[PDB]
Design a protein around this ligand. Sequence first.
Ligand code: FOL
Ligand code: FOL
Lengths: 159, 159
Amino acid sequence: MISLIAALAVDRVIGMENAMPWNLPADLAWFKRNTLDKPVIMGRHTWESIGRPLPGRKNIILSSQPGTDDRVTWVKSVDEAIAACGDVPEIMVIGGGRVYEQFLPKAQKLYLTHIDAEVEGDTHFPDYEPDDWESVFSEFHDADAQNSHSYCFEILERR
Amino acid sequence: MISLIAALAVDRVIGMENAMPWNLPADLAWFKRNTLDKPVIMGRHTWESIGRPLPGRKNIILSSQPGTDDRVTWVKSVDEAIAACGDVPEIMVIGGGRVYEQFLPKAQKLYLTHIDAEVEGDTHFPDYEPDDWESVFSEFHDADAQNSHSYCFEILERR
Ligand SMILES: Nc1nc(=O)c2nc(CNc3ccc(C(=O)N[C@@H](CCC(=O)O)C(=O)O)cc3)cnc2[nH]1
Ligand SMILES: Nc1nc(=O)c2nc(CNc3ccc(C(=O)N[C@@H](CCC(=O)O)C(=O)O)cc3)cnc2[nH]1
């Protein structure tokens, strides 16, 4: 099963030119815990930004480009992407945008981080129809000494 | 010779209850670079924000309470602290708020990082009579893929 995971700001903003202005270790931590030991699919840019494969996980890159790093697996198609995940219980899509778009329709579960932040982004998580999904988990947290903003943990299952 | 280093948001904001909303890897670099191979004087909470002893530097913590970590050197005054530095060309003072207050008077130089952001502050960089200093270096930068905000670095010497 495919699952998407993402951090979202107000308006479903997920990306921009510049570095996101916020400090969410707790989020990083959530992400971690939810991806660890699972295959992860991501696009080129994401891969770039990250700059090293994520330890503990089968890193799969979705590009058209040929890719240098042999530490990961590159693929050119959604089908391939999936193919490369083998026999697993959950496949985790980590974006970006188009990636999310592509996988959304195959996606059965979503892990979303809702951040109380307002920014001018260039990228947005694809709109999804609420009526189609069920919140089976949600967990609010205020900003604290380590998290610059308040944010909330949500997991939706496809209805 | 004494110097102070700090990064100030608008209005001398240097701290908040919660996490600063910005991510400035470049300022840290600047910080590292200007503090390396010199004694760094800090106050207890910074030290606790830092969590470990800064490599390449000699860590002096000014406080009322008694040590907790054999690694660094604890002092109770500004004279001791200054003492603990020994004969060295420049002593770097690093915060927080109180500390900087107590050293401001003896400083001959300021290493400032003016951050482009409005935040409701809890601590502030000591006020300093701009007439009393000469800017001797300044360097602007724009926010980018790695730094959420724009900032300018500056060095001021006591006139
Ligand atoms: N919820 C969510 N939060 C995110 O930050 C996020 N980021 C991406 C893509 N960007 C990144 C960037 C960095 C790392 C990363 O460094 N991950 C480390 C966490 C390291 C830590 O705890 O410092 C990992 O080992 O998973 C992952 C994804 C995708 N989905 C997200 N989804
Ligand atoms: N310009 C400036 N920026 C700061 O962030 C700052 N911080 C303090 C006290 N706060 C801190 C907290 C953590 C680290 C720290 O990890 N420093 C590393 C750099 C690490 C890196 O390159 O990630 C060091 O080794 O110097 C430093 C200062 C004092 N003056 C400052 N001054």
